[PDB]
Design a binder for these strands. Sequence first.
RNA 1: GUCUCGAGCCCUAGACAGCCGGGAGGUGAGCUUAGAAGCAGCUACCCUCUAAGAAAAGCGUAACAGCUUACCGGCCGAGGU
Lengths: 70, 172, 29
Amino acid sequence: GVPPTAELIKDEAGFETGSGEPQEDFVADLSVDQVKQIAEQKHPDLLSYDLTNAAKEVVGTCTSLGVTIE
Amino acid sequence: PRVELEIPEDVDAEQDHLDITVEGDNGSVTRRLWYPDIDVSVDGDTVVIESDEDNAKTMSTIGTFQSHIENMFHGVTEGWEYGMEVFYSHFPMQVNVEGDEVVIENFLGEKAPRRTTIHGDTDVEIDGEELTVSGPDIEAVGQTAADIEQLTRINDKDVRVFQDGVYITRKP
Amino acid sequence: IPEWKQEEVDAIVEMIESRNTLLERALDD
RNA sequence: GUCUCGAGCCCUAGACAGCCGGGAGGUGAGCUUAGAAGCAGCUACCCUCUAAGAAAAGCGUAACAGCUUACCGGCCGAGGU
Ligand SMILES: [Mg+2]
């Protein structure tokens, strides 16, 4: 239902395209709360029981694009 | 070694010399199981295959005799059935059972009828483009089925283009 | 005596406290 | 082909093989591209549910689909490699 992860990131990140080589080319950044919000939309798309695990999944499609955390 | 085969309640198996006969509601099958130092016998309710030798060659036949007998058990009860489909592209192939042999006419437009004789008490039933080969003797049934497929064999031309013939659809 | 089998037997006994052979196992202790 | 002898490893906490069932989600990863969604190329190859299940080992498609390997479970039961 709710739009994919790759898109929900490009919004609150301010950037459109990722990086040719991830974790090596830190394109964007995301606050902890910025990821907490993206974990509130994908409640159905994810299999996790707690909001904690829901984050982990989302936080797995960022460092593989250059979306550092802080 | 020694292997014991418990015969099914539906069946009764008799044996004299190197010959074993298996009778069931679906018929009877007699076979010769002859090999150096391998004794096959009917011990009341079980068939026994034993030998004092255990070399690779002996073990090979022992295992072979087992499946032969087990296959006979299955043949006299549930029976054996091979399914076949007659496929043709341009020339309508006529497959009929005449006497104790299946005849195929107009194969690839051939004027001369191709034919093969049926082995043993094997029954061949045809229902349109479907054939069913059946009987209690897997040897006889298997061959009859195979012979039918081999009957439409073509060596002269490219088989990928000339695919006409009867083929084995289901194997038991 | 693979360790993962021993560790699984423990994890099973733990959930029972609060493979079919590892279940059967975790039922006899 | 067959006979004999040795070494290592796995196995009744069920091995080897076969058969049945499962082979799931984030997500059709990002990039490149009109498109590429395991499988044209480049890079990375991360975490959830769980008894398993790759950012996919091999076919397959225009691309999907589809078919299976890995992996887990059952059936079986004795040696297997
Ligand atoms: Mg020619």
